[PDB]
C-alpha cells in the first residue's frame, strides 16, 4: 500500500549465576508481528509468527537464525561492557535493548529510519534523523559515540535502512493474499455533578494509526480530552477511545472526529439516544 514499516525489537536480560542472557528479537511489518527469535530453547531458531510467513524457504530461517545468534552475542558483550561503563556491581539483572527499522511511502524509498539502543530501560545512544550522527544520552555513552564515529558505523547502518530494510519490507508486503476501517460509537455516562462524559470509540481498525479528536462548536477544545493509547483487540485489529466532559443537556454541541487510512473521509459523530 502507501505508508508501511518494518521494525525489529531486540532485548537481552541477564541472569548471573543462572546462565547466559535471554535474547529475543521480534519483527513487525506495519503493526503485525511476523517473526521471532528467542534464545531460551536448546536449539533456538528464527520462526514465523503469521500465516503468510509459513511458506518461506528454509534458507531465510537459517540465515536469520545465524544473524540472531550474532546479535545475541553482541548483546551479551554489551551487557558486560555496560557494567563497567556505569560502574555497577556484578550479580544483578540488567537489560539491553535495540530498536531499528524503516518506514516507506508509496514510492518505496526510505521516508524515515531508526537505530537506537537502551541500557536498563534508558536511552543509551541513537542515530539522528539524518542517519549521519549519534546522540549519546549521557557521559557513559559518549565513548560509544566516539568509537562509532571513528569506525564510520552510521554509514553502514544508513546503508542497511536505505537498502536491505526498505527492500525486504517491499518483499514481505507481496506475501500471502489491506486496511480495516474503524466503526465508531459515542456513549454517555453520568457523573456526580450536572455533567456527563461522552466517550468516543473507534473499533475494529487496522493499521493502528488513528486520530480521535473532539470539538466544541466545530473548533478546538478548551478542556483536555482523556484518552487511552491505541490497543490490540486480540484478533489483529485495534481500538481506541477519547472522551470529554460536557454539561448535561449540551451534549450535541460536541462532535467526535475519526481519521484513518481506510475511511474515504473522516467520520463525524455526536451523542444520540
Amino acid at each position: 500500500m502507501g505508508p508501511h514499516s518494518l521494525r525489529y525489537f531486540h532485548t537481552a536480560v541477564s541472569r548471573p549465576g543462572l546462565g547466559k542472557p535471554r535474547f529475543i528479537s521480534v519483527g513487525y511489518v506495519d503493526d503485525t508481528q511476523f517473526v521471532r527469535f528467542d534464545s531460551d530453547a536448546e536449539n533456538p531458531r528464527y520462526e514465523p509468527r503469521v500465516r503468510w510467513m509459513e511458506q518461506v524457504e528454509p534458507e531465510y530461517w537459517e540465515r536469520n537464525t545465524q544473524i540472531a545468534k550474532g546479535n545475541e552475542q553482541i548483546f551479551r558483550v554489551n551487557l558486560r561492557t555496560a557494567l563497567r561503563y556505569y560502574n555497577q556491581s556484578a550479580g544483578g539483572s540488567h537489560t539491553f535493548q535495540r530498536m531499528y527499522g524503516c518506514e516507506v511511502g508509496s514510492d518505496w524509498r526510505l521516508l524515515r529510519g531508526y537505530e537506537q539502543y537502551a541500557y536498563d530501560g534508558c536511552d543509551y545512544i541513537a542515530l539522528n534523523e539524518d542517519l549521519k550522527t549519534w546522540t549519546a544520552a549521557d557521559m557513559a555513552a559518549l565513548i560509544t559515540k566516539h568509537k562509532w564515529e571513528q569506525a564510520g558505523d552510521a554509514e553502514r547502518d544508513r546503508a542497511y535502512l536505505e537498502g536491505t530494510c526498505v527492500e525486504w519490507l517491499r518483499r514481505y508486503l507481496q506475501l500471502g493474499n489491506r486496511t480495516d476501517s474503524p466503526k465508531a460509537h459515542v456513549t454517555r455516562h453520568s457523573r456526580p455533578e450536572d455533567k456527563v462524559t461522552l466517550r468516543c470509540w473507534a473499533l475494529g481498525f487496522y493499521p493502528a494509526d488513528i486520530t480521535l479528536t473532539w470539538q466544541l462548536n466545530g473548533e478546538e477544545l478548551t478542556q483536555d480530552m482523556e484518552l487511552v493509547e491505541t490497543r490490540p483487540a486480540g484478533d489483529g485489529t485495534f481500538q481506541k477511545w477519547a472522551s470529554v466532559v460536557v454539561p448535561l443537556g449540551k451534549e450535541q454541541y460536541y462532535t467526535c472526529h475519526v481519521y484513518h487510512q481506510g475511511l474515504p473521509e473522516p467520520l463525524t459523530l455526536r451523542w444520540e439516544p
Partner: peptide, 8 residues
C-alpha cells in the same frame, strides 16, 4: 531481513 548490532 535483519541487521547486525554494534558493540558499545
Amino acid at each position: 531481513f535483519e541487521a547486525n548490532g554494534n558493540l558499545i
